[PDB]
Every structure is written in structure tokens, then in C-alpha cells.
Design a protein around this ligand. Sequence first.
Ligand code: NI
Length: 341
Amino acid sequence: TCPFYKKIPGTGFTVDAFQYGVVEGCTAYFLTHFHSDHYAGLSKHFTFPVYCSEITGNLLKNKLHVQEQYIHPLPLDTECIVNGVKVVLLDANHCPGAVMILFYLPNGTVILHTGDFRADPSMERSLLADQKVHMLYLDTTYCSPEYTFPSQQEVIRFAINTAFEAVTLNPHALVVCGTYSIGKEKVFLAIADVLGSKVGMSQEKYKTLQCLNIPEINSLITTDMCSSLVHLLPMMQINFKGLQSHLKKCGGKYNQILAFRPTGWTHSNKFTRIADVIPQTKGNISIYGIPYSEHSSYLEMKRFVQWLKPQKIIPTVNVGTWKSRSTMEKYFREWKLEAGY
Ligand code: NI
């Protein structure tokens, strides 16, 4: 049974609610982004209308084989009418194709559902600037002040400088980057660009990237592993054992691996600056954990909410424990008292 925080009151709509069977009263199922915890339940046998971005709709058709007649892609930043209700999709600054959804209820209530997002001051000049929001369904993934991490630009500067140094010192070093979902493509694309290489990967990953409308992508990626010195591997293979095994397969072309694991936050963030990050090393293999987040830091979240000034907040992440819920509610009240709404 579908939880209340996935239902939009006063509509026939649900958000990211595909694992509950037929939801009573639902006339349109919205999907914010193509990550498995959110699409869980969709397949080629789904026969209700799904509303989403163009990029999410490419992934649904080619990866999950959802039939075309049930995919309803909407343009961003554009007022659309769905089953009698005005909606707008906004870029969520999450993974490719990820959106926030603005619903303009027939009774005058305005609701923002962030989906998964990384709050940014650029959102303060979207279509959100133009009207009041009563209810905010908020991605609270890192809603506590211990969650700090650098900008995505600082992290990519670290990665490019580390990779270029290593490979210039040793032209026989291979770079490997871990992946297990869409998102974070700038890590491997920025490293391959500085090295003058295409990124090499499996046919299944190539297929996924071909759905993302990234400009000039045919120039940047390939399935010919032998032609590339930046390889993508599943995140589970980014360990000394899996990397040793991969280096064997490359036929003595390479004699060293430098590997990256883009994580979100890890507790080494509460002590160490990005500049001071060091790898774990075993022989000719080094592994860097880099804090490349596609979710809001605590401070980014707080700034967004204090600007938007919603009347009510409904968290969508960390809702399963009383301790988490009580923590989050305490911060929402602080933010409101400090800002004066
Ligand atoms: Ni996500």
C-alpha cells in the first residue's frame, strides 16, 4: 500500500509510486527520475499513463521496454494541463532527466515535489520565483548539519588534476571509474577529455548513455575498450581484487590502475578537505573515494527552504525512524524561526 507522502491530495496523482500495484484513485503516475528506488515496479506490462521528462521517457522505452502509447514526456519550464490540472516540470540538478514537479491544485493550493534534487541558487530564478508554494515534498537525504561536501566543480577539478598527473608520469597507467546507475557522468567525461581519450564501457552502459541527450556524445564514448584509456566498470568491481582481474584482461597494455569511486558523503568529510584526499593503495593499484554529490548539502537545503518559505514541509527521505523524523522537524522549526515565516 502506497504511503501518504507519495500522494498529491486533490488530484488523481501519485509520484514515484510504481511498486504498490494499482493505486486506488490514481489516473496518472508521475516519475521524477530513472533511479531504481523510484521506478521500482515499472516494466513492459505497465498500462497506465506515466508522466516524466523526455530523457526519463527514452530510458523507460529502451531500458525497461515500457510501450510508447503509455509514455507521456513533457517539456521543461512549460505550463502543461494533465487530467485537468496545471503542472510544470523543473530541472532538479540531480541525474540526467531528473525533475521537480509544480502542481497548481484546482482549489488554489500550490505544491512543489522536489523528487531527488541538489538545491542551487539558480532555482531562485526559475518559474518558482513567480508564486507562493503552500506545501513542499522535500528530498531530505542529507538533512543534518554534519553533511558537508564540496561543490561539484571543486571535485571535478581534483579528479582531472589527479588523473592528468598520473598518466603523464606513467603513459602505461589505465584510469577506471565506477558506476551503478545514471548520474555523475561528468566524473568520467571530464577525465577522458583531459586525457584525449573516449570513455570505454559495456554495451549495456553504452545503451543507457545513448538515451541521455548529451551533446556530441558519439564523440565521447565507445564500446571498443582497446581504443580507450578511461574504462567504466560496475561499482562492485572497484576494489583491489576486481581491479587486478580487469588489468589481466588488458593484455599487458597497462601496468598501473588509478580508480575513482564517486560516493555521496562519507565520514572522512567531517575531517578532510578535498585538496588533502589520498587514495587506498596496494601495489600498482590506487583507489580514490571522491565526494561527488547529486543531493543537497545541509546548507544548500536550508538556503532553498528559507527562500521558498513553504507553509508545510513533508519529507520524502529518512521517514522510517522516529529519531530521523524528530531531527528533521526540529531543523524545519529552526529555519522558520530564524527567517521569520
Ligand atoms: Ni535519485
